[PDB]
């Protein structure tokens, strides 16, 4: 039925004669058909939060009801496309309107109804049988790299009465008929799934395999795990490119909920040009990747819903028997949006203005990652790795967002106190930097690398010893000097990764192992006494200055042109030079 | 009991947030439970929060999503939330509301109880006397836990405290003097935890053959907050039933009550009460007191109850309201230090700032052994001196030290090597810990044992 707007207050819209409306029922507003959703009920008089500016809307305008809550659209062709926070096809919209501006484009389908993909039914199916459902029933015959296999919506299982033959179809036509109950059914290649629900699964299993990244600091101190969860300061975007490039990531999802506009144009320009070369065939990484753009320009609820939309997409592709590596640009801006909307509702706030349920919502966003066993007759597994970003607030440690985040995230890394070098982006804060996956991965490490096992501990020993003695130095034995100069070298070389240069754009784990082994073996045979083993530190420095320069200049060996063998050989030669210097010391 | 039929309503004035306004209710009660039936056929449950006039507002555990303004219905239990309880609940697992998590059946109601609990008459409280074996050298030798002593543990985020709790549960028990260990039981309660550290508990506690004396509760982070606030009281009430109505000694373990405080903030925000210190209601002190003071022995009974909760300190701040108040209403604390965790010592316990207020009665000759107190005090003092001597060495150099300083440094080193480190499965008996302590003490020569009475030295030192 129809309604009438009783009042307007910024992005809020009071209305009347809305008896029977649901809690999150979508609704169109005004003659512009602005999209919104129910928030509060007060009898027939309700309140609606809208997704676009309300300027010009008058009193008494029509209000149309719909029968669905917020939902996303699914099917072929999602990969390789770009979407808004409420799943608008930006590219197709700019194509149709042929104008730079975004009009009030209230009617456009997420996936084109004209492009036809070659559907192929599974051979094991037979028409007119009593299979009683099962998920997989067909497959898109080809895309560039990833075949978009098709499944049956959950909660809907039934016998078979007709299956379409092989052929090209536009996804607007029906290929399934699964009556099974005296009530006929029809399904195309397109599904609708509510965003805020959770797609059920058969089972969840513990982590059983690591995750590889290029960054040395993540790989050595706080390794990540496939199917894992992590948070990283937002002080970086190259990490998404690196994990897609090297790690075993099938599909990539990147979501900018509130990024700056220029950086978002930067990403849009640079991302498609990149390539993968899976097996010598140069293939664009965009083919295995989908985007959800949302700058600060868009209204509040677009930013609110971008995260949930992305998580729904990742879950859907997880069900398809793949591995997905998601990264969110930031969570602080989402929290600010929540603050703004809570203040709009005039619901009384908690500390720092944030609504009390912030922790509950952050829990809802998390606890959806992990390795799982999908729901289906064909057995398969899907992994979801979530990499959130906590942009540094003014109160880094005291931010409620950070406090709630540290109560959930399995593995966390953070920046130390803001150093004099504002460009010290690969820092480390030993106060709060930790991991929770050492137990489930040492068995894997033992079969590949074993030298690092005491070295990782010894590095921490050295760093904490320096941290203890530093304040005393500021306000003096030689061994103290050896410790602090080694720690300074470690911070100057092992940390402070560049990223924007090829020689530190990516680093294989073996390069890290070699350079760290050399850098720490420097200390392992220089701390045995004030001498080489049981002079002073100044004597050691004067004796081995060239050694220190070469230790520093390890970093420049580019993996791109220099293979692993050559860099290993150079490091080993430098180690031999260090040994020669030790013998003459 | 109740004999009148249950009622059903469809009058729904509106909804605001997680609360639902109804009207035209005859004699509504304060905290009576109700059920909800969405028009699509889903089931839900909730608790009446506030009542005024013929109107009555209700919170919903599973969320207020999908509620229809005119096509929903509700039913009134007409009574306060009661729990089914029985001694056979051992070996089971639940989700806070009592719904089984494993594949077992519903618990038979051997009895019904009120979850809110009751205060305890102070006249009946009996001073704790005995001690509970824990299998950890730090908790048993250097410190102690009596039959009734409420000892929290502080631990900053990201440090291994769940492992300590799990090992305590696995290796819990009583001192074998020569009405045995069968009387001992455990009630474990974990709240606001990740799905990891939950599968870990449910698997590992099964892998070590100990479900015969454990009653476990889990509440993941994504669960309703009202489940979180409800669960610990449920645990305490089942503990009280199993310990007092049936003669048992019960060790209750609570994990991360900071999340319980977060849920308390949630419910306070729902009721629109003005926040105070650090966004916490003032009455949270009395609330925590209600969750505490369910321990100690009682005359006319041979049982006991002992609480060992765990807390997450925000940014190592002792003056934060949570740990400060907890200290105001607890009898000691055990610290966990970051540097020790970085030193790859599996038990990271830092025994220096820790302190137990009831050492003097928990041990003695009739207890584990007579020499225990002397050994403990001497160990503590000489460790303090050893840390001081390492500080001395930091500047004065090794050549400027005496033989005594070398003894202190060597003793310190061997002490963290052996006394502190246990291993994830090494269940040490108390006598074994005292033997290790004596072996370490023997390094120093006879005369330096200033804290040791001479008779004990003659008996044990040789």
């Amino acid at each position: 039925t129809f309604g009438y707007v009783h009042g307007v207050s910024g992005p809020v819209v009071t209305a009347c004669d809305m008896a029977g409306a649901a809690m999150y029922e979508l609704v169109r507003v005004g003659h512009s058909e602005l999209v919104g959703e129910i928030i509060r009920l007060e009898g027939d008089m309700a309140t609606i939060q809208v997704y676009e500016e309300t300027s010009g809307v008058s009193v008494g305008d029509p209000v149309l009801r719909t029968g669905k809550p917020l939902s996303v659209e699914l099917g072929p062709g999602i990969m390789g496309a770009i979407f808004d926070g409420i799943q608008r096809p930006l590219s197709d919209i700019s194509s149709q309107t042929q104008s730079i501006y975004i009009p009030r484009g209230v009617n456009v389908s997420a996936l084109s109804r004209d492009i036809k993909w070659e559907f192929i039914p599974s051979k094991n199916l037979r028409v007119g049988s009593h299979i009683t459902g099962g998920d997989i029933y067909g497959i898109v015959n080809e895309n560039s790299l990833i075949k978009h296999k098709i499944m049956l919506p959950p909660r809907n299982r039934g016998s078979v009465t007709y299956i379409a033959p092989p052929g090209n179809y536009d996804a607007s036509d029906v290929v399934l008929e699964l009556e099974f109950e005296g009530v006929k059914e029809k399904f195309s290649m397109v599904q609708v799934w509510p965003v805020r629900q959770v797609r059920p699964v058969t089972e969840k299993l513990p982590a059983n395999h690591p995750l590889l990244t290029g960054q040395r600091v993540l790989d050595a101190l706080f390794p990540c795990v496939q199917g894992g969860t992590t948070a990283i300061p937002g002080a970086k975007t190259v990490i998404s490119q690196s994990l897609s490039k090297y790690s075993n990531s099938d599909v990539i999802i990147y979501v900018g909920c509130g990024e700056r506009g220029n950086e978002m144009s930067e990403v849009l320009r640079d991302f498609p040009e990149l390539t993968m070369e899976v097996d010598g065939k140069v293939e664009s990484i965009m083919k295995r990747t989908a985007l959800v753009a949302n700058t600060s320009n868009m209204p509040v609820a677009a930013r609110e819903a971008s995260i949930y939309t992305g998580i729904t997409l990742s879950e859907y592709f997880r069900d398809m028997g793949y591995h997905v590596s998601m990264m969110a640009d930031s969570t602080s801006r989402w929290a600010e949006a929540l603050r703004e909307i809570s203040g709009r509702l005039a619901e009384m706030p908690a500390d720092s203005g944030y609504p009390a349920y912030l922790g509950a919502r952050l829990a809802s966003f998390y606890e959806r990652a992990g390795r799982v066993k999908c729901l289906g007759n064909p057995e398969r597994e899907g992994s979801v790795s979530i990499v959130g970003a906590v942009s540094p607030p003014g109160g880094d440690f005291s931010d409620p967002v950070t406090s709630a985040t540290l109560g959930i995230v399995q593995v966390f890394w953070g920046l130390d106190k803001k150093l004099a070098q504002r460009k010290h982006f690969p820092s480390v804060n030993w106060l709060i930097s930790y991991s929770k996956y050492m137990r489930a991965l040492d068995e894997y490490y033992d079969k590949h690398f074993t030298e690092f096992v005491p070295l990782r501990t010894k590095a921490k020993e050295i760093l904490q010893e320096e941290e203890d003695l530093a304040e005393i130095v500021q306000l003096l034995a030689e061994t103290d000097k050896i410790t602090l100069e080694v720690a300074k070298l470690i911070k100057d070389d092992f940390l402070q990764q560049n990223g924007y240069t090829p020689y530190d754009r990516f680093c294989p784990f073996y390069k890290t192992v070699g350079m760290l082994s050399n850098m720490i073996s420097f200390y392992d045979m220089a701390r045995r006494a004030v001498e080489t083993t049981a002079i002073t530190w100044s004597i050691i420095r004067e004796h081995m200055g060239e050694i220190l320069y070469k230790l520093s200049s390890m970093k420049f060996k580019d993996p791109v042109k220099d293979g692993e063998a050559k860099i290993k050989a150079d490091y080993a030669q430098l180690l031999e030079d260090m040994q020669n210097a030790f013998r003459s010391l | 009991y109740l004999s009148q039929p249950r009622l059903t309503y469809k009058t729904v004035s509106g909804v605001n947030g997680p609360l639902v306004i109804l009207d035209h209710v005859k004699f509504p009660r304060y905290a009576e439970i109700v059920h909800l039936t969405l028009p699509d056929g889903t089931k839900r449950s909730g608790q009446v929060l506030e009542v005024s006039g013929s109107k009555a507002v209700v919170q919903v555990f599973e969320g207020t999503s999908g509620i229809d303004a005119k096509k929903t219905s509700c039913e009134f239990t007409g009574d306060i939330l009661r729990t089914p309880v029985s001694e056979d609940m051992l070996g089971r697992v639940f989700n806070g509301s009592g719904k089984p998590i494993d594949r077992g059946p519903v618990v038979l109601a051997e009895d019904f109880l009120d979850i809110m609990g009751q205060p305890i008459n102070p006249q009946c409280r009996i001073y704790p006397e005995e001690m509970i074996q824990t299998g950890i050298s730090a908790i048993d030798g250097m410190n102690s836990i009596a039959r009734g002593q409420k000892i929290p543990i502080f631990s900053a985020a990201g440090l291994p405290h769940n492992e300590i709790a799990a090992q305590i549960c696995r290796q819990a028990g009583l001192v074998k003097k020569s009405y045995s260990e069968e009387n001992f039981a455990i009630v474990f309660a974990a709240m606001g935890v990740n799905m990891e550290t939950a599968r870990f508990f449910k698997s590992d506690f099964e892998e070590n053959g100990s479900m015969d004396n454990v009653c476990l509760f889990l509440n993941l982070a994504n669960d309703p907050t009202i489940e979180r606030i409800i669960t610990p009281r449920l645990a305490l009430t089942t503990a009280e039933f199993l310990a007092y109505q049936c003669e048992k000694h019960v060790l209750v373990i609570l994990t991360d009550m900071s999340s319980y405080a977060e849920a308390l903030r949630e419910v306070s925000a729902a009721r629109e009460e003005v926040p105070g210190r650090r966004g916490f209601p003032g009455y949270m002190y009395t609330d925590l007191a209600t969750i505490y003071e369910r321990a100690g022995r009682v005359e006319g009974r041979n049982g006991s109850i002992t609480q060992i909760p765990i807390l997450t300190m925000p940014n190592d701040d002792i003056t934060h309201p949570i740990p400060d108040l907890t200290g105001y209403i607890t009898e000691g604390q055990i610290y966990v230090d970051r540097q020790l965790h970085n030193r790859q010592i599996y038990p990271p316990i830092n025994v220096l700032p820790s302190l137990s207020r009831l050492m003097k009665s928990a041990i003695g000759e009739g207890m584990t052994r007579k020499d225990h107190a002397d050994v403990s005090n001497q160990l503590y003092a000489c460790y303090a001196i050893g840390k001081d001597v390492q500080a001395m060495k930091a500047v004065v150099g090794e050549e400027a030290l005496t033989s005594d300083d070398l003894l202190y440094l060597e003793f310190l080193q061997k002490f963290e090597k052996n006394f502190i480190t246990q291993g994830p499965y090494e269940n040490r008996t108390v006598y074994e810990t005292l033997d290790i302590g004596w072996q370490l003490l023997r390094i120093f020569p006879k005369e330096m044992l200033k804290r040791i009475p001479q008779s004990t030295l003659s008996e044990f030192y040789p």
Binding site: A346, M348 | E272, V274, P275, G276
Partner: peptide, 13 residues
């Protein structure tokens, strides 16, 4: 705290 008290006071109408 004073701001919050005032907004509640006004909300009582």
């Amino acid at each position: 705290f004073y701001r919050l008290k005032k907004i509640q006071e006004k909300k009582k109408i």
